[PDB]
Write a protein that binds this ligand. Structure first.
Ligand SMILES: O=c1ccn([C@H]2C[C@H](O)[C@@H](COP(=O)(O)O)O2)c(=O)[nH]1
Ligand SMILES: O=c1ccn([C@H]2C[C@H](O)[C@@H](COP(=O)(O)O)O2)c(=O)[nH]1
Ligand SMILES: [K+]
Ligand SMILES: [K+]
Lengths: 316, 316
C-alpha cells in the first residue's frame, strides 16, 4: 500500500528513535536522516489509516500558490491553521486592550477557564480580520511565510524574485535542468523568525515525461505534521505537472530531524494496528491549466474512505 | 445472582417459546419481546454457569471501537469470529483457484472430509490476510460491520459520521440528553447485506452520575450468542463510563426475536442444573482514559471461576 512508508517511519522511530528533549520538553523520540518515496501513479498518498482534512491542505496550498501571506484568505475558507501566529502579534501590541494572553497556547491546556477567555479573544480577532481591511492588513499579514518566500523572495536590491514562477518556466524550457530548486531558507531572516521554515527546500526533476519532486524537511512531527505534509507536496507535484503538461512521477520526502512527541505514543500505536485501505485518486480540472489561478473546486479527490480520526494533544 | 436473568430467559423459552422454523430449519423455540437488566455495580455479567472466552469479546469489542472493519486485527489476536464472512468472498471471486467451497458451513458438518479441505483453504486464507497487505485490504475488509457503522456512518453527501465519538461528547456536555443513541441499522444497506446487524441500536442514559445502557437486539441465539452479547455491551458500558468519568449503572438487554435452536435443547437443560457462582469483577486501567486507544492489557477481569464449557452444534 502507498502509505506504508509512513507506517514504517512510525515503527522505526518507536523502536529506534532516541529520547531527545526539545524546547518545551513535551519529549520526543527521534531519528535524523530519513527518506520515503511515493509513486503518484499508484494513487494520492493521503493517509487512509486515519482521516485527514484534505480541505485544509487544499486551501493552505492555494494560499501559498497565490503568494498570499495574509490570514484572511484562510479564514474565508474556515482554515485556522495559521491563526495563533497572527493572533500572537495582535496580543503583543499597543492596541490590545484585554486579558494578558501571555503563553496562551500553554496556559489554555493547563486551564479550562483560560481556554475560554483565550478562545473568545481569538474569535473576536478572527472576526476583525474578516471585516476590518485595516486590521487585516496589519495583524492578518504574516509577512514571511511560504507564499512570500516561494513567490516574493526579497533581494538586496529592493526587488522581488518569483522562485516558483521562474522554476515552472525553467521546467517547460529546460526539463532536464538539475537546478530546478525552490528554497524557503533565507539566512538573514531565519534568526529573527518566530518559526523558521520547516519545509526548507524542494527540487523538481523530469524524466520520461514524468515529473518528480524531492522535499527536504529539517523537522517533522510524525504523528501530527507528516500526514498533512505528505499530501501538501504530493498535491504540488500534481499541480506543477498539470501546468507543465507532464505526467506524474514520484514524491520523495527527505527528513532531517523526524520526531514523535512522547504524548502521541498510544495514538500512533493504535493507528499502527490499522490495516491500510486503497488510496484515493486526485482529479484536477482539465480546462484550467494556470495553477496560480486555481480554486478549491478545481481540485477534486476521489474514493477516500479513511478510518476514524485519531485525537492527540498538540505538543507545546 | 447476576446471571439469573439469563437463566430465567432460558426457562421461559423452554416452556413458553413456540416452535418457529427459520431459513435453514434447524428449528427454533422462540418468544418475541423480552427485557433483562443487569446491575454492573454488583459485578460483571459474564456467565459463570458456563465458561465464556472473555478474550474473544475483549478483542472483538476493541476491534469495533477502533472503527476497524478488517479481519486482520482479529486474526492478530487469534479471534476467528468473523472469518467465514470474509472467507465467503475469497471463495466467491475471480482469483479463487481451488475446491468448490460452496455451502461450506453446511457441507462441512455433513462431511468429515470436506471439513478438512475447507479447514485448509480457510487456514491458507487466514495466512494470506496476515501477511499480504494487498490481499488483506481486498478480502480482509468486511466493509459494513459494527466498527464502520458506529464510527464511519456514510452520509448522502459522501462524508462520514462518527456516531460513537459524537455521543461520548454529548454525554460529557449534555448528560441528561434523551437522544444519546448509536444506531447500526441503515435502510439502504440492510437489504443487500449478507447479515444485517443483530444489535440494531443502543441508548445511553445518565442519572445520579451513573451511566446505564439499553440495547435493542432484533434477533438472538439464546444458547450460543447471548452470553457473548451480554458481556460485550456490559463491557462497553464500563468503557464509555470510564472515559466520561461516571460510575457504572445498569445494562438493559431488550430482545425482539429471542430463540433457542432445537439442537441446543439438552445443552441448555444441562446448564440450567448448574448453580451460579459469584460474578467476576472488571478492572479498567486507571491511567488510560481514551477508550479508543485501549488495548487488551488495559481491560482486566478478576475472580472468574466458571463451570466447564458446554459444547453445542452451531446451527446453520
Ligand atoms: O507542517 C508541519 C509544520 C511543523 N512541523 C513540526 C516540526 C516540529 O515538531 C515543530 C517545529 O519545531 P522546530 O523545528 O522549529 O524547533 O513543528 C511538522 O512536522 N509539519
Ligand atoms: O452476537 C450475536 C450474533 C448473532 N446472533 C444470532 C441471532 C440469530 O440466531 C442469527 C441471525 O439470524 P437472522 O436474524 O439474521 O435471520 O445469529 C446472536 O444471538 N448473537
Ligand atoms: K537558501
Ligand atoms: K437507523
Amino acid at each position: 500500500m502507498l502509505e506504508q512508508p509512513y507506517l514504517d517511519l512510525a515503527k522505526k522511530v518507536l523502536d529506534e528513535g532516541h529520547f531527545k528533549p526539545d524546547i518545551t520538553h513535551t519529549g520526543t523520540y527521534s531519528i535524523f536522516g530519513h527518506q520515503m518515496r511515493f509513486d503518484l501513479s499508484k494513487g494520492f498518498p493521503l493517509l487512509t489509516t486515519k482521516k485527514v482534512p484534505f480541505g485544509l491542505i487544499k486551501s493552505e496550498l492555494l494560499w501559498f500558490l497565490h503568494g498570499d501571506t495574509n490570514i484572511r484568505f484562510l479564514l474565508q475558507h474556515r482554515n485556522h491553521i495559521w491563526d495563533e501566529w497572527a493572533f500572537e502579534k495582535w496580543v503583543k501590541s499597543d492596541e490590545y486592550h484585554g486579558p494578558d494572553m501571555t503563553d496562551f497556547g500553554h496556559r489554555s491546556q493547563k486551564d479550562p477557564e483560560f481556554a475560554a477567555v483565550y478562545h473568545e479573544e481569538m474569535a473576536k480577532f478572527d472576526d476583525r480580520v474578516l471585516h476590518d481591511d485595516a486590521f487585516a492588513a496589519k495583524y492578518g499579514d504574516l509577512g514571511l511565510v511560504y507564499g512570500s518566500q516561494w513567490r516574493a523572495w526579497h533581494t538586496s536590491k529592493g526587488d522581488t524574485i518569483d522562485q516558483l514562477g521562474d522554476v515552472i518556466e525553467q521546467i517547460k524550457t529546460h526539463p532536464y535542468s538539475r537546478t530546478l530548486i525552490v528554497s524557503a531558507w533565507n539566512p538573514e531572516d531565519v534568526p529573527t523568525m518566530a518559526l523558521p521554515p520547516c519545509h526548507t527546500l524542494y527540487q523538481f526533476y523530469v524524466n520520461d515525461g514524468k515529473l518528480s519532486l524531492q522535499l527536504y524537511q529539517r523537522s517533522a512531527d510524525i504523528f501530527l505534521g507528516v500526514p498533512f505534509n505528505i499530501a501538501s507536496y504530493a498535491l504540488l507535484t500534481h499541480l506543477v505537472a498539470h501546468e507543465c503538461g507532464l505526467e506524474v512521477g514520484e514524491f520523495i520526502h527527505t527528513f532531517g530531524d523526524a520526531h514523535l512527541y512522547v504524548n502521541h505514543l498510544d495514538q500512533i500505536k493504535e493507528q499502527l494496528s490499522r490495516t491500510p485501505r486503497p488510496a484515493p485518486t486526485l482529479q484536477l480540472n482539465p480546462d484550467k491549466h494556470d495553477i496560480f489561478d486555481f480554486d478549491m473546486k478545481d481540485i477534486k479527490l476521489l474514493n477516500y474512505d479513511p478510518y476514524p480520526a485519531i485525537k492527540a494533544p498538540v505538543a507545546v
